[PDB]
Design a binder for these strands. Structure first.
Ligand code: SF4
Ligand SMILES: [Mg+2]
Ligand SMILES: [Mg+2]
Ligand SMILES: [Mg+2]
Ligand SMILES: [Mg+2]
Ligand SMILES: [Mg+2]
Ligand SMILES: [Mg+2]
Ligand SMILES: [Mg+2]
Ligand SMILES: [Mg+2]
Ligand SMILES: [Mg+2]
Ligand SMILES: [Mg+2]
Ligand SMILES: [Mg+2]
Ligand SMILES: [Mg+2]
Ligand SMILES: [Mg+2]
Ligand SMILES: [Mg+2]
Ligand SMILES: [Mg+2]
Ligand SMILES: [Mg+2]
Ligand SMILES: [Mg+2]
Ligand SMILES: [Mg+2]
Ligand SMILES: [Mg+2]
Ligand SMILES: [Mg+2]
Ligand SMILES: [Mg+2]
Ligand SMILES: [Mg+2]
Ligand SMILES: [Mg+2]
Ligand SMILES: [Mg+2]
Ligand SMILES: [Mg+2]
Ligand SMILES: [Mg+2]
Ligand SMILES: [Mg+2]
Ligand SMILES: [Mg+2]
Ligand SMILES: [Mg+2]
Ligand SMILES: [Mg+2]
Ligand SMILES: [Mg+2]
Ligand SMILES: [Mg+2]
Ligand SMILES: [Mg+2]
Ligand SMILES: [Mg+2]
Ligand SMILES: [Mg+2]
Ligand SMILES: [Mg+2]
Ligand SMILES: [Mg+2]
Ligand SMILES: [Mg+2]
Ligand SMILES: [Mg+2]
Ligand SMILES: [Mg+2]
Ligand SMILES: [Mg+2]
Ligand SMILES: [Mg+2]
Ligand SMILES: [Mg+2]
Ligand SMILES: [Mg+2]
Ligand SMILES: [Mg+2]
Ligand SMILES: [Mg+2]
Ligand SMILES: [Mg+2]
Ligand SMILES: [Mg+2]
Ligand SMILES: [Mg+2]
Ligand SMILES: [Mg+2]
Ligand SMILES: [Mg+2]
Ligand SMILES: [Mg+2]
Ligand SMILES: [Mg+2]
Ligand SMILES: [Mg+2]
Ligand SMILES: [Mg+2]
Ligand SMILES: [Mg+2]
Ligand SMILES: [Mg+2]
Ligand SMILES: [Mg+2]
Ligand SMILES: [Mg+2]
Ligand SMILES: [Mg+2]
Ligand SMILES: [Mg+2]
Ligand SMILES: [Mg+2]
Ligand SMILES: [Mg+2]
Ligand SMILES: [Mg+2]
Ligand SMILES: [Mg+2]
Ligand SMILES: [Mg+2]
Ligand SMILES: [Mg+2]
Ligand SMILES: [Mg+2]
Ligand SMILES: [Mg+2]
Ligand SMILES: [Mg+2]
Ligand SMILES: [Mg+2]
Ligand SMILES: [Mg+2]
Ligand SMILES: [Mg+2]
Ligand SMILES: [Mg+2]
Ligand SMILES: [Mg+2]
Ligand SMILES: [Mg+2]
Lengths: 137, 122, 138, 208, 99, 82, 148
RNA sequence: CCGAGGGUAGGGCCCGUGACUGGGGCGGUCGUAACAAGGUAGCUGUACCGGAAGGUGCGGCUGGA
RNA sequence: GAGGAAGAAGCCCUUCGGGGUGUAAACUCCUGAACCCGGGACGAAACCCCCGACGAGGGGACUGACGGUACCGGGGUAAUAGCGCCGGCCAACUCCGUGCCAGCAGCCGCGGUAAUACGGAGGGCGCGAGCGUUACCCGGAUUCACUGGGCGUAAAGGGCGUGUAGGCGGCCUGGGGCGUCCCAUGUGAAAGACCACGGCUCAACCGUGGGGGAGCGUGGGAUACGCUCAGGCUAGACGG
RNA sequence: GCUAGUUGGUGGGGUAAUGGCCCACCAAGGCGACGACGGGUAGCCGGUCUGAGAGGAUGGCCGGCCACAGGGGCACUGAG
């Protein structure tokens, strides 16, 4: 593994477009702090710190919309899109003025800073910036 | 290509080539006519166009088109020319400017006179 | 076309004299002009843009063909006698319909002589001259 | 300078009466009452479907023609609007209206902009008691758009004035008649006016 | 202030002077990724007390010869031969970049 | 030496000076050390002078010598009243 | 009712012994300017038939598009197979900055103020089908919270 | 002492040009190699040969049966 | 400029009835660019002299190239219009002539007897003291792709390993605070650009004021991520 | 692949002043794929032009610095 983070969100993304009830990602504090976010923003139901063969995982409990009417029943997605921005190849770091503004509001972009793993709305109100971790809508 | 590769190799800026080298960057150039004959054009056209091979003051010799019907140009005509290839003609990459130097305008020209070097009919 | 007339001279025996004006019906010399040539009218800017009576008479009497030897320096001559033709307006350059040689024509032997002799000993020209070629037929 | 030429043909191609002549436009002797097809050799010929670009060209030409202004002066105005704060459309038409000689006509001093221009040019108008002969003066809210009171004793101001004893100039305007004054209080609202111009199509013209 | 930089001594084979390798990092003006570059400084050891591996700081200073415009402010870390090879293995790598 | 003078700005028959302190041996309109206020000779708006008197003092004190028409505008708005 | 604008009429051809036989196709957007749009592509052996058939499937295939003061709630970028359309939300003063293809499908969506750009294949059909799917993908603060 | 530069001698890099020569791009004579199993499946690296396209050996690929 | 015919003449077109240029002209009247007279500047208040004290404050005088110009006032004649285009892109259509000729051409192409693609004409479109063309730069070109591209068959995976430099790198706790973020402070000249106001009758031009940002220097602070150092694990990797 | 004033040092000259700036002696160094050496082209910046922007492109006029005054070399006087 080279990017635990990308792996994670990409565990979500991979699992949601096949509508898994949950998905387990290998564990880290930093990963939880971000998961804490997805939930707290209504992207996932939630998560817990379970176990497989004695290796700390987190189960993530996914979330969708209703079945829909038509030839495609499949529910619209809650997390529509979620891609890494800062990266081990290319670090991305924004200032507070520089802080991007997702989907004209309706999406977010979680970002590590020296005052927690906030969100874009948060960082603007908490007046800081940092490594733009990803973006979700 | 990865981001390291562009840190490393960079990207190559595009280099455009001139299609009027013999101008030496000038808007126009003057020349003396070394040869005035006609030439035939390629498939699918068929005609006898009026070219002039011209010695430039950049010291290029080039061969130029003569626009219009009928010219008064010939060996030793001091002429002035401009960028502009002629598609049907191999190796023509300039035109003569009509109504300049020894280049006459065109007799009985009424529409688009300016492009044929032709004063206004009273 | 419009031209500046900076100063006006007058040629004496042993000196030039500067003047401020030349009245009608008098000759002198002007410095300043650039596009001007012999046989041309010249008027004050806001005047009847008239052209003086040109001149006009004799057509050249003697004809001599000139061969640009070799050959990328034919046109040393091409720009040579265009400088010449506004310097002497009595010779006449022409190129032959058939045969394609260059045919300077003149007011007499003597006239062609110096014009030719100049063309070489003043313009180097790699060239020789003589009897024009004849356009034959079957 | 201005278009000056034959001026019925304008509206004729423009499929719309632009009220350019003034005293004759209402007359049934106007060109548009009699022949409302385009000018020259091909008017009663059965029209071809107009390209999106035609549409915006034709439409932009309509306005530009109304105020009888050069394409140069026109675009520079329009260009100003964009960068000015808010709605490029209104503000253009606004700034387009806020120019002198079209005031002079909206206040019926003269019969058309054409006649209006001549008025301004000939000095027969003034703003704030200062003579102003410049057809372009961007009149700003507050001004005292007189008539040169040395030009008050004249047959043609009288005529058009006298015929404006109690008609209603737009909201943004105040024709104190008799004394031949006026006043410009308000740069128009979008709704404040109607002219045969889709204010947006022009914005889409220059968006090309 | 007098500029202070920090590096490893990569050459003590000079008389009262040492070679001091200095890395600084920054992101690429177009590609944002962080890059290293490095620059070897000739630094004045009046008391010849600085040897190989000696990570040291150097202070901007009044010139002492040509290209010796810093002297060593203090010994900070010592015996870092791993950064000495990190350069010599690159340096030596050059012999095979010829033709 | 160091001087207070009028560096012309503006346009043709539209003077608009810009009284200023600079090093004599400049170009007139050259790099000045510090602006100390304008002056519009033709007096075309109420403000055709506004010497920063707080400052104009500091310069006279540590060297600045002035134009025989810089004082004129300086004395005008009295940097000189005892 | 609705308004129709043909966006693309075009004459294709098939081969058979002793010559080529044609088959006109046409792409027609249909709309209200108040929020309901639709796109249909009918091809009949004669121009008008198709032009009218295209309109039949046009209505028979409609889209939401929820306007915010004559503009879209969120910038969107949908790729319809090489063809890729990009819609940006724009101020009351702007205009409809699009092609002719997105332009029609935007104007009769009753959009008045958009920024767009066609990357990719700019094939009018494909670009059309794309601008559609992108509109169909639009969402407001409501549905966003609804889902959360 | 150094020293503009002048001279002597041997190198290196570029540009122009050259009897004649090499193929290359553009605008009738000979065959018919490729494209259908193209009438010997096609292409291939190499090798040898032949007016020419090409043929043939060895080995390879299917983008052939 | 306003008025000015179911609409002159000439020209163009025609199914020969008509259509067009065209309210355009003529014609009526109204204004009055140039010109003619009369006035006529701002830019110039200091330097100096006078009272005072050669200082502060006060008062007096001389000096204008542009310029008899700007502008102000009187009088006052209908008074230059031109260039490109009209197959598609691309707004603008007919007749005639021509007949792979003469020519056009930015690309597609057009011309071999009915050419909206050449040449003229009428008409039309667009600009207007300008209109076109040539050269060059950026754009369209997301066609060197950071934003923002690709590589089975379209150009594109190295013939395959091994490995140097390099780039990148699991999970937990801590020290440092290098990156990264935050505040303050200095610097970031003037002109310019930008928003407001104002001087020239408008504008171009020009004056005043405001707002500053990047980027660097200095001081303070945060600690998540990246780094570094210190310790621990066993999911990677290696070994028995 | 580059280097003998070449890189360092002691001592001294020189300067307004540091310095291999110049000179003697000693050491044997200095630089280089993070592109030395070499060849091409170029005065640099405020700016300007373009571009949605990131970016490209460009440095006439105006303001600042540099550099040259027919090609070179030199030194004088001087605060310079
Ligand atoms: S009369 Fe007035 S309205 Fe009727 S055409 Fe002539 S101008 Fe247009
Ligand atoms: Mg042919
Ligand atoms: Mg042909
Ligand atoms: Mg001749
Ligand atoms: Mg001549
Ligand atoms: Mg009068
Ligand atoms: Mg534009
Ligand atoms: Mg380096
Ligand atoms: Mg030393
Ligand atoms: Mg020494
Ligand atoms: Mg379908
Ligand atoms: Mg794709
Ligand atoms: Mg295409
Ligand atoms: Mg919805
Ligand atoms: Mg020597
Ligand atoms: Mg020598
Ligand atoms: Mg000598
Ligand atoms: Mg040779
Ligand atoms: Mg075969
Ligand atoms: Mg065969
Ligand atoms: Mg075969
Ligand atoms: Mg086969
Ligand atoms: Mg073989
Ligand atoms: Mg044989
Ligand atoms: Mg054989
Ligand atoms: Mg075989
Ligand atoms: Mg096959
Ligand atoms: Mg009739
Ligand atoms: Mg008639
Ligand atoms: Mg008639
Ligand atoms: Mg009229
Ligand atoms: Mg009168
Ligand atoms: Mg005065
Ligand atoms: Mg006294
Ligand atoms: Mg006078
Ligand atoms: Mg003047
Ligand atoms: Mg008067
Ligand atoms: Mg008249
Ligand atoms: Mg044009
Ligand atoms: Mg166009
Ligand atoms: Mg058209
Ligand atoms: Mg007929
Ligand atoms: Mg013929
Ligand atoms: Mg033409
Ligand atoms: Mg015909
Ligand atoms: Mg035909
Ligand atoms: Mg034609
Ligand atoms: Mg054409
Ligand atoms: Mg654009
Ligand atoms: Mg380009
Ligand atoms: Mg290209
Ligand atoms: Mg990329
Ligand atoms: Mg591609
Ligand atoms: Mg292939
Ligand atoms: Mg392989
Ligand atoms: Mg190999
Ligand atoms: Mg390694
Ligand atoms: Mg690392
Ligand atoms: Mg890590
Ligand atoms: Mg820090
Ligand atoms: Mg500034
Ligand atoms: Mg004003
Ligand atoms: Mg300012
Ligand atoms: Mg450890
Ligand atoms: Mg010393
Ligand atoms: Mg040296
Ligand atoms: Mg020595
Ligand atoms: Mg030695
Ligand atoms: Mg070099
Ligand atoms: Mg050189
Ligand atoms: Mg140079
Ligand atoms: Mg772009
Ligand atoms: Mg680009
Ligand atoms: Mg300058
Ligand atoms: Mg020199
Ligand atoms: Mg000289
Ligand atoms: Mg010299």
């Amino acid at each position: 593994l080279t990017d635990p983070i990308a792996d994670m969100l990409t565990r979500i993304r991979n699992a949601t477009r096949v509508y898994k009830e949950s998905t387990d990602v290998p564990a880290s504090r930093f990963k939880e702090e971000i998961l804490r976010i997805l939930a707290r923003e209504g992207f996932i139901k939630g998560y817990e710190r379970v176990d497989v063969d004695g290796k700390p995982y987190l189960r993530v409990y996914l979330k969708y919309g209703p079945r829909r009417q038509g030839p495609d029943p499949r529910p619209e997605q809650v997390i529509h899109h979620i891609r890494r921005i800062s990266k081990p190849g290319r670090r991305v770091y924004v200032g507070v003025k520089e802080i991007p503004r997702v989907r004209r509001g309706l999406g977010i972009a979680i970002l590590s800073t020296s005052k927690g793993v906030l969100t874009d709305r948060e960082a603007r109100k908490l007046g800081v910036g940092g490594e733009l971790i990803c973006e979700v809508w | 290509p990865t981001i390291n590769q562009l840190v490393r190799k960079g990207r190559e800026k595009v280099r455009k080539k001139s299609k009027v080298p013999a101008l030496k960057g000038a808007p126009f150039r003057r020349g003396v006519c070394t040869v005035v004959r006609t030439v035939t054009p390629k498939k699918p056209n068929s005609a006898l166009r009026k070219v002039a091979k011209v010695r430039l003051t950049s010291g290029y010799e080039v061969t130029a088109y003569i626009p219009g019907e009928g010219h008064n140009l010939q060996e030793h005509s001091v002429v002035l020319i401009r960028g502009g290839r002629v598609k049907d003609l191999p190796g023509v990459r300039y035109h003569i400017v009509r109504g300049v130097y020894d280049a006459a305008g065109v007799k009985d020209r009424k529409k688009s006179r300016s492009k044929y070097g032709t004063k206004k009919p009273k | 076309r419009k031209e500046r007339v900076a100063r006006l001279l007058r040629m004496h025996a042993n000196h030039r004299e500067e003047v401020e004006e030349l009245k009608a019906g008098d000759l002198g010399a002007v410095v300043g002009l650039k596009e001007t040539i012999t046989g041309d009218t010249l008027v004050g800017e806001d005047a009847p843009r008239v052209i003086l009576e040109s001149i006009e008479v004799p057509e050249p009497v003697i004809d001599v063909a000139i061969e640009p030897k070799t050959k990328a320096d034919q046109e040393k001559l091409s720009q040579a006698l265009a400088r010449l033709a506004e310097e002497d307006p009595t010779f006449r350059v022409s190129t032959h319909p058939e045969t394609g040689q260059t045919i300077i024509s003149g007011m007499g032997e003597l006239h062609l002589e110096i014009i030719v002799d100049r063309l070489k000993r003043e313009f180097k020209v790699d060239a020789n001259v003589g009897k024009p070629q004849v356009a034959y037929r079957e | 300078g201005r278009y000056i030429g034959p001026v019925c043909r304008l509206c004729r191609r423009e499929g719309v009466k632009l009220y350019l002549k003034g005293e004759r436009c209402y007359s049934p002797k106007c060109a548009m009452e009699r022949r409302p097809y385009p000018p020259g050799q091909h008017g009663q010929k059965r029209a071809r479907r107009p390209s999106d670009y035609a549409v915006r060209l034709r439409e932009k030409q309509k306005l530009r023609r109304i105020y009888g202004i050069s394409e140069r002066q026109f675009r520079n105005l329009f260009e100003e609007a964009s960068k000015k704060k808010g709605v490029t459309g209104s503000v253009f038409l606004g700034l387009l209206e806020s120019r002198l000689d079209n005031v002079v006509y909206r206040l019926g001093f003269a019969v058309s902009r054409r006649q209006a221009r001549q008025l301004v040019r000939h000095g027969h108008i003034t703003v704030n008691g200062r003579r102003v002969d410049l057809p372009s003066y961007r009149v700003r809210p507050g001004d005292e758009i007189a008539v040169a009171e040395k030009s008050r004793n004249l047959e043609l101001i009288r005529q058009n004035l006298e015929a404006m004893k109690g008609r209603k100039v737009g909201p943004w305007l105040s024709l104190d008649v008799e004394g031949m004054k006026g006043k410009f209080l308000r740069l128009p609202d979008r709704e404040d006016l109607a002219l045969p111009v889709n204010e947006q199509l022009v914005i889409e013209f220059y968006s090309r | 202030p007098k500029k202070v930089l920090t590096g490893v001594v990569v050459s003590d084979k000079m008389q009262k002077t040492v070679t001091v390798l200095v890395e600084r990092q920054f992101p690429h003006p177009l590609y944002g990724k962080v890059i290293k570059r490095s620059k070897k400084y000739l630094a004045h050891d009046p008391e010849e007390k600085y040897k190989l591996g000696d990570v040291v700081e150097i202070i901007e200073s009044r010139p002492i010869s040509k290209r010796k415009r810093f002297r060593v402010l203090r010994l900070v870390e010592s015996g870092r031969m791993d950064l000495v090879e990190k350069y010599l293995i690159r340096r030596q790598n050059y012999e095979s970049l010829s033709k | 030496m160091v001087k207070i003078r009028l560096a012309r700005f503006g346009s043709k028959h539209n003077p608009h000076y810009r009284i200023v302190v600079t090093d004599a041996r400049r170009k007139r309109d050259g790099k000045y050390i510090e602006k100390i206020g304008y002056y519009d000779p033709r007096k075309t708006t109420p403000d055709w002078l506004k010497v920063d008197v707080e400052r104009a003092r500091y310069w006279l004190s540590v060297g600045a010598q002035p134009t025989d028409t810089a004082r004129r505008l300086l004395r005008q708005a009295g940097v000189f009243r005892q | 009712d609705f308004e129709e604008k043909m966006i693309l009429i075009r004459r294709t051809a098939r081969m058979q012994a002793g010559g080529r036989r044609f088959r006109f196709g046409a792409l027609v957007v249909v709309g209200d300017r108040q929020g309901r749009v639709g796109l249909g592509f009918g091809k009949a052996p004669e121009v008008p038939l198709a032009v009218q058939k295209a309109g039949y499937y046009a209505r028979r295939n409609m889209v939401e598009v929820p306007l915010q003061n004559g503009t879209i709630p969120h910038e969107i970028e949908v790729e319809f197979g090489a063809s890729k359309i990009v819609l940006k939300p724009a101020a009351p003063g702007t205009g409809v900055i699009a092609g002719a293809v997105p332009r029609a499908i935007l104007e009769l969506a009753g959009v008045t103020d958009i920024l767009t750009k066609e990357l990719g294949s700019r094939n009018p059909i494909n670009i059309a089908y794309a601008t559609m799917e992108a509109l169909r993908q639009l969402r407001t603060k409501a549905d966003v919270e609804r889902l959360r």
